[PDB]
């Protein structure tokens, strides 16, 4: 058990340890304080017989001469087992549910490893979010990276909860699992998530990593990578189709800027790290499917946009990543619409791999195209005569019945499509582009 009693210098969150041997870059450490308090840290630098570390909880109260540093001999790791489903952890993969101690099959590097370009497979089949405006129009496929954006307080937390409890896959024998990671969420909202997850029984399908707004920022960095490591284990080793949901990754970006500022790495994107884009890119790129392996990992990141005019590095991060998008809007949130999805700007690039026959149903693409076109022109009607009373009434009925379904009420794609037909009939029967005469 390696531990040194040689702290020479502490400056802010950083400590200088001396007469050291065998310490490695980014290895984990524990500062065992002179009072017996233990604090976690990481190795920033190792120089000959010296090591500079950064203390996660800060260096308050530390007496240098009567404390020691234990060198754990490994990087940041996740304990890994099939027992994780039905369990709740914190930002560091430590349990928070008071549940039975889990024996990891193995510990894996939280960064994971990078896919061989040869071995990567196309995203294909269909994940049923249980939400029409997603499942039907902006279809989520397994292996896709589909983020949801919005302004503060736009149902995105509730929407993420709904997708977490209602998402499943239809024809796969080997079952669906969902990994939920909350990033810097207030205790009230995390507790709300827990009561909802527990009442719905969705925890039994889930692995949850909860990080709170007052948690250490470095834990906010670790949480999404924690989630993706668990997802990659379940998907590529235990063969599951895994859905990863990440709340307020904007909170993640701010925490990453915070950690960078503590390390004094003079950064140049409005104080943000500068590699902010590359960090999110390496994080976002961790989705997809591997050749010859039945598993899949899917990401739904949730982010917050202050305004479209306001220039910020975080929205431009989103610009570098998107493979589609689902957009929530405040003016629309007020209207009482349950998922406030402005359907026009939201897009899914890979919708067509998930739609079809044997996947969703034959009517999927057809219904989607007609609904979108008619809704665009009919909303612009809400903005004579040929602006159809029928059209604008269809747009408002579409928003108040079809897109609004209840955060606790899931629409199967069959029922989504059947409702689509129900209200699609209230349209001029020969005003539709339909190369297959439908005859429902």
């Amino acid at each position: 058990i390696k531990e040194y009693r040689t702290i020479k210098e502490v400056v802010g969150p950083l400590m200088a340890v001396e007469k050291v041997s065998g310490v490695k870059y980014e290895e984990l450490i524990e500062v065992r304080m002179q009072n017996g308090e233990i604090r976690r840290g990481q190795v920033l630098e190792v120089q000959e017989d010296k090591a500079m570390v950064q203390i996660f909880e800060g260096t308050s109260g530390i007496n240098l001469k009567n404390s020691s540093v234990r060198f754990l001999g490994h990087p940041l790791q996740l304990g890994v087992s099939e027992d994780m489903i039905g369990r709740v952890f914190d930002g560091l993969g430590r349990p928070k549910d008071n549940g039975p101690e889990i024996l990891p099959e193995k510990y894996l590097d939280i960064n994971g490893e990078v896919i061989n370009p040869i071995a990567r497979d196309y995203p294909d089949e269909f994940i049923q979010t249980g939400i029409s405006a997603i499942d039907h129009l902006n279809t989520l496929v397994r292996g896709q990276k589909l983020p949801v954006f919005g302004p503060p307080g736009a149902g995105k937390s509730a929407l993420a909860a709904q997708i977490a409890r209602q998402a499943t896959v239809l024809d796969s024998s080997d079952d669906f699992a969902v990994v939920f990671a909350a990033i810097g969420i207030t205790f009230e909202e995390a507790e709300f998530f827990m009561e909802d997850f527990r009442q719905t029984g969705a925890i039994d399908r889930s692995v949850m990593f909860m990080n709170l707004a007052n948690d250490p920022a470095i834990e906010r960095i670790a949480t999404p990578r924690m989630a993706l490591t668990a997802a990659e284990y379940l998907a590529y080793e235990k063969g599951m189709h895994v859905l990863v949901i990440m709340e307020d990754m904007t909170n993640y970006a701010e925490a990453l800027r915070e950690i960078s500022a503590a390390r004094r790495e003079v950064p140049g994107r409005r104080g943000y790290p500068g590699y902010l884009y590359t960090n999110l890119a390496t994080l976002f790129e961790r989705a997809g499917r591997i050749r010859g392996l039945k598993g899949s990992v899917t990401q739904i990141p949730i982010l917050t946009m202050p305004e479209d005019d306001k220039t910020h590095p975080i929205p431009d991060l989103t610009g570098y990543i998107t493979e589609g998008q689902i957009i929530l809007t405040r003016e629309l949130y007020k209207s009482g619409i349950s998922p406030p999805i402005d359907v026009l700007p939201s897009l899914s690039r890979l919708k067509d791999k998930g739609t079809g026959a044997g996947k969703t149903r034959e009517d999927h693409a057809a219904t989607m195209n007609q609904l979108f076109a008619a809704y665009a022109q009919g909303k612009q009607a809400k903005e004579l005569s040929d602006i159809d009373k029928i059209y604008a009434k269809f747009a408002e009925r579409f928003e108040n019945e079809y897109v609004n379904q209840g955060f606790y009420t899931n629409r199967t794609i069959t029922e989504t499509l059947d409702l689509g037909w129900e209200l699609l009939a209230m349209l001029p029967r020969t005003e539709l582009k339909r190369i297959k005469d439908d005859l429902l």
Partner: protein
Amino acid sequence: MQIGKIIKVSGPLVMAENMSEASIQDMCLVGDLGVIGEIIEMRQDVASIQVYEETSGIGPGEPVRSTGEALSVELGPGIISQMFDGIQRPLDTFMEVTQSNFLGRGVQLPALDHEKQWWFEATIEEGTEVSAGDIIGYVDETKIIQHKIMVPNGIKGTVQKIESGSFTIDDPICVIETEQGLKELTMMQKWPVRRGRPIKQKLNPDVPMITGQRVIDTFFPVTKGGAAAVPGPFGAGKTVVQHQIAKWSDVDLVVYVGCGERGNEMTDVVNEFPELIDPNTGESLMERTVLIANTSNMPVAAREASIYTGITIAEYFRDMGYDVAIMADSTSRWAEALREMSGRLEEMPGDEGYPAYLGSRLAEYYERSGRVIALGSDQREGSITAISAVSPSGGDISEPVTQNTLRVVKVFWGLDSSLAQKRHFPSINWIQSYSLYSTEVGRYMDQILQQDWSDMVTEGMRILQEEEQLNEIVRLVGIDSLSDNDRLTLEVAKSIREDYLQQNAFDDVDTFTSREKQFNMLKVILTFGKEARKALSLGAYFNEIMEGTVAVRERISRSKYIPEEELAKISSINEEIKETIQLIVS
């Protein structure tokens, strides 16, 4: 032989002592894992190494071993139809050796098969005096391509013994008694990636390359040795244009370089190239391709080096007298890798955070292409044609990468997202795009077609320009405002756009249009333009012409679909056109 000791590890930068014998830019295997790194500094015996992989878990005391060379490429039999990364690591051999889907750290795999058996057929007589570049024999690496074993640079002398035989690329196939001594030759030579390969002489690229893409080859053509930037927004093309030129170009070899793109954008090419067997030779495209593959999450140094590794291979093949075409998709990702490593080195920014050397780096890359007289006694002629896709975020061509590229390339095919939504998918905006080769290739095509081709190209461009100007008076004051011949000018412009400019990549006949076919298809459109104006000069009206030319004009519509065996049909069109109008004019 000298073992260095790590004395410092801090993120990407490792400092190792006792490495006085290494050189700057030497590559090293760092730490116990042996992860690859590059010497950027040296202070006494202490070298500063910038490593290409993650340094997590590496610390003082561990060994560092220099590979005694800079980032280099292995060049010899076994290179064609292989898929490397930016540093020439065999991706399929990763699959096989490491038995995993992931690129582990510090694992070294030789690029070529040093165990494979190849039949060397010697072609030099014993006693022949040789200098660098001389072909001493060949191996039929594929059914298509003859891999010509050349004497390496820096070697001169007399062949003492050489005999045909079955060997490895490690076994000695030839013996050269140079002034210093006798040293055997192998089938493989290494070359530093960042240093261009020596040539006898650089030439002007004046011969046009046959893309089979009508837009390009007639209005914005690229010569064998020229350079073409493909700047456009997403979905406009520029991955299909890369593919299209790689398929149908009249070039021996193709080096496709994937510059740290998104994972799925690479998955596409990875699967789609093998089934792109063009029937000009009847063998697969991979049979003539070297593919460098890099994804968005792959090591930054690999993404940055990708294009240089690729152009080194392209140089190695044009040194045998071959024509080579190098494809970069996309150089914007390459520049983002460059910027990332410049920032992590804490360098001084230039524009948009890009390094100050961004421009000079781009010039260094593009000037390594071109038409060259290769080394060797016979003074062979080779060419490298560079086609580089750029993805300016938001389509802004004022951005540093595109502006610096446009500074040195001489061909610009600017993709326009508006034409793509219009499904004019050879989106190459005819007004904004250009080629500074157009006049020289015009003289070339005038002589070898023995027709007045360039007169036709200027006339077509003239009607397109006038189309642009007349569509504004259309938008503001209506189509009825226009002259009768003005409406004719627009309709012949619609002919040139829809019947000639638009060209489907996925139809067997439209995907490639030969020089002969290009000339005839343009000619019939232009003869239509000529005859109808005479009608108006006599007093016939535009509608009078259109009602009566419906059929002949549907024949020009299908001109692109007539196969390469039956171009007499297109030749028949223009004459049939002429006879048809004379009945309408009355």
